[PDB]
Structure formats: structure tokens, C-alpha cells
Amino acid sequence: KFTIDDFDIGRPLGKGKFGNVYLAREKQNKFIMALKVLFKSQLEKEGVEHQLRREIEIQSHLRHPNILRMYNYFHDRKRIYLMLEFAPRGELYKELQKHGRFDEQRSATFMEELADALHYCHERKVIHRDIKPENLLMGYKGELKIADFGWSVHAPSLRRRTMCGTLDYLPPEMIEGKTHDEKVDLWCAGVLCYEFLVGMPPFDSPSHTETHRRIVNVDLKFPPFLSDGSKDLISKLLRYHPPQRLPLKGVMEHPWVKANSRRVLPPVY
């Protein structure tokens, strides 16, 4: 088993609620990774122990080029350590903020990578429920990495009831107090595609109630610079009725995605 001494600590990458994340190198293999440190006492105090172990259970069992890998984890007296894939290009949201909006190539590539990872999760009855730029990191060649599974759930049988995620990303069914299923992620993918290309989410409003209203009416207003292809994909994902939303395989196969994605799969061992 691993201990902290097994790693050269390079530098902090980010602060979190329960500890920091560090650029680290495993000594035996000189292998560079990220180390998330969490304090056991603060986790217990906040009452999030079972939350954390759920997140760890879900993420530690996923192996996909577009899902941030958790290699392993360990603990000592005071800390829980998560050994995570290092994502050299960092936060996708910082890149979006830096550029304002992404071009079609960048957006289409991201959409293919997202749809592929989400398909992988859904194949295993894992629903993500909080797809948004802030939850995505970028690999060495800019590959999308789903980084956070904070709202995620393994949902084998029962449809779900928890309202969760982020205001601008909530599907109509959550807002309206209906049960939901994996098709929530289809909706969030449509919101994400729109935000990639426009730089603002589609139902942006100064109040919770006006945002809620625009969502349930699907009050979609496409800026004029958007291509017909991108609007076609977004419109096919942002459907009021979950069963009418374009399936993940459908996103991967969409002509706009095919025409514009320059997705590259990372080398595998």
C-alpha cells in the first residue's frame, strides 16, 4: 500500500473544501499525477463521509480516456489521499473564460469526447447529473476529462428524485419535481454545447424564477453567428420530453460533430 512518503510533492494545483490538490510524482515509477488531500476530521464535521465514499466508489471503477482516472487511494492518521490522473492543460472553465467562446472545431471535439464518456457511464448505469465546464479538465492534447462526480449516482433500477446540479443546467423535469433518469445528462450536454459556442448558458437570467421559467418553456434563443449544424445538435438535445432527446450515440454520429471534431485518443499501454 501507498503512503505520502512514496511521492515527491511538486506544488499545489488548487484549493478545495476538504484539502488541496497537488502536482506529485510517484517515486518508484517517476510517474506524475495529482494528489487530492482530504482531512478526515473536516469531512466528518461537515457530515459528508458517505458522500465522499460514493464519489470514490463511482470514480475509482471508471476507465475511459475522457474520464479523469483515479489510480488508487490511501490514508494516514489525519488525511485521505486520492491518486488522480494529472490533466496538464488544467480547468476547461478557465480556458472558456480566457477565450470567451470556443470555435466549432473545439466545441465539436469536446462534444464527441463528452458523449463517449457519458455513454461509458450510462452503460454502467452511472448518471453524472452535473455536466458543466467547471467539472471538466483537459489532457495533454486538450482532451476533455470528466473530473468531478459530485452529483453522480449509480442508478440500476429506480428512477431518481434528487434535484441536483447547477441552476443554468437543470433539466425541466428536475425543476418541475418529476422523477428523472439518465436522460438528464442529454439535456446538460445540450446546455454545455451552447455554452461552449456562445460563452453563456442558454437560459441565463438575473433571477432563479425567470431561469426556471425559460428552462421549462425551452426558451432557446440562438445567436446569429451559430452554424445550422451546431443549432441542429443543441435543439435535438434541449428537448422538453426526455425520451425525445438525441441519444449519446446520436451526438457522436451527428453530422456537425463528424464534420468538425478533431478528437484524438491518447496512446494506451
Binding site: 500500500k1 501507498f2 515527491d8 511538486g10 506544488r11 502536482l23 510524482r25 515509477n29 517517476k30 510517474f31 506524475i32 478526515k40 469531512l43 466528518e44 463521509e49 465522499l52 465514499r53 470514490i56 466508489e57 475509482s60 476507465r63 482516472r69 489510480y71 488508487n72 487511494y73 490511501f74 490514508h75 494516514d76 492518521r77 485521505i80 491518486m83 494529472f86 496538464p88 489532457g139 495533454y140 492534447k141 491518447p266 496512446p267 494506451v268 499501454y269
Partner: protein, 43 residues
């Protein structure tokens, strides 16, 4: 900040790691993990 963790040394290492992936499934994936229920217990 140790030398390996910045500038050209880091970039070099990151690139080597991308193009020469190790067997993480054996190197780390096979190594024992603390049981999730024992995470908030003795170490």
C-alpha cells in the same frame, strides 16, 4: 518548487508520459486499497 515540477523539465516529463504510457492497471490498479468503510478509521 522542485526542478522536475516546473518549466521545461515538467513539460518534457508530461510529454514522455503521454507517449509512453505505463501499465497503471498493474502498477497502481492491482495494489491494495484501504476498504472504503475503514477510510475514517485507524491507519
Amino acid at each position: 518548487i522542485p526542478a522536475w515540477a516546473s518549466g521545461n523539465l515538467l513539460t518534457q516529463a508530461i510529454r514522455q508520459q503521454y507517449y509512453k504510457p505505463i501499465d497503471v492497471d498493474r502498477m497502481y490498479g492491482t495494489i491494495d486499497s484501504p476498504k472504503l468503510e475503514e477510510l475514517f478509521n485507524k491507519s
